[model samples]
Target: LIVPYNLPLPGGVVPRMLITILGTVKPNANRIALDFQRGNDVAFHFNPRFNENNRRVIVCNTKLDNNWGREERQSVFPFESGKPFKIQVLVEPDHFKVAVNDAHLLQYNHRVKKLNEISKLGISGDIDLTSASYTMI
Candidate 1:
């Protein structure tokens, strides 16, 4: 468990795959980011911000060739500073279903057409990772 952790997805992402991340938000955390990447391209960018104009929100987007796409923001913030949390990302054919603390949070549709090409899970910022893993269910 570490900050700025990158886990290689040897098997790549597949439908019905479930990715789990367990961590604790820093007491003075301002942001946390988790990404599914293929080399320098990010297929899914999951970012939670606590200090954007004093409003908390989760921003989802895709980055291809270093260019970012339209951002999708979710105002329903489920993370708390200094608290532990569990995040689950379920892979589907068309989109990724995300859950925080066992509750459905939001879904980000597929922007990177080939899911198998996204072979890395990158995590960084404002949190201490307890565990990160992927499994088929």
Candidate 2:
């Protein structure tokens, strides 16, 4: 889908449009998450892991992107899953703000975290990305 950007976004946060199912394969066991800190960022999360706690484990690899693949999320909802996420994210000028299910979480730095690698995202275990999209305004 054509994600739309209606507001101003800060640099460093994930582009705000992304999805990940790489971890469901048996290699990516680490669970990582991201949430938008500014504006109203939303996305469809159908993956079992991304939806439900499942294994009760997930990790975010900062080496790739300070903020994990947060097409619409920056900080994932810890210990919760298996449901639709009315996420909110803010692409601050210097930080990636993330909020999930209405609750807020971490802010990822953009300068220290390079832009080229911002899109490098992966999910641990095998999961399906049903339909997802996001935008940074």
Candidate 3:
């Protein structure tokens, strides 16, 4: 499902956001992604792929102007198949700090410069998400 969030405060200006997601990875799932967007541009794509190169890894990247940036492969795949998981994607002015299952993961620098343009999020693929939450930082 796709979700929209406002990056503004009472004064309509903020440089950060915290996105949290709770879900379960299907037993036979291959992959899933949590994307942060600027209209159609994907500012950050948090992807976890199973059966690719091996298991226990998370891939992070960005897509701008229909071109994708270099992928960042890190993490020990802190999620279990058919079990509940939590992921937090913290958006900062310069980079994104990601954490999985309450532990720190990796960081990604901004490839799509303007943070204010990021007002939407998309979660898709073989995941059974239970709850998605957002908050300002």
Point to the candidate with the largest TM-score: 1
Clashing pairs in 3: none
Q: Please report, as a residue range, the 10-residue window in candidate 3 with the lowest summed lDDT.
A: 4-13
Task: Give the per-residue lDDT digits (tens) of candidate 1, residues 1-137.
Answer: 86799989886799999999999999999999999998899999999999999999999999988999999999999999999999999999999999999999999999898888999999999999999999899
What would the TM-scores of all predictions be?
Answer: 0.98, 0.39, 0.84
Local accuracy of candidate 3 as per-residue lDDT tens digits, 52-76: 8675678888887888979888857
* TM-score, predicted candidate 2 vs. hidden true structure: 0.39
Give the range where candidate 1 is weakest over 10 consecutive residues by summed lDDT: 2-11
lDDT of 3 at 9: 22
Please provide the root mean square deviation of candidate 1 (C-alpha atoms, Å): 0.6
Residue-wise C-alpha lDDT for candidate 2, range 44-83, written one tens digit per residue: 1212244334444233222222333443233243433333
Q: After superposition, how far is residue 66 of candidate 3 from its true place, in Å?
A: 1.4
Show model 1 residue runs off by greater than 4 Å: none
Candidate number achieving the greatest lDDT relative to the actual structure: 1
lDDT of 2 at 111: 33
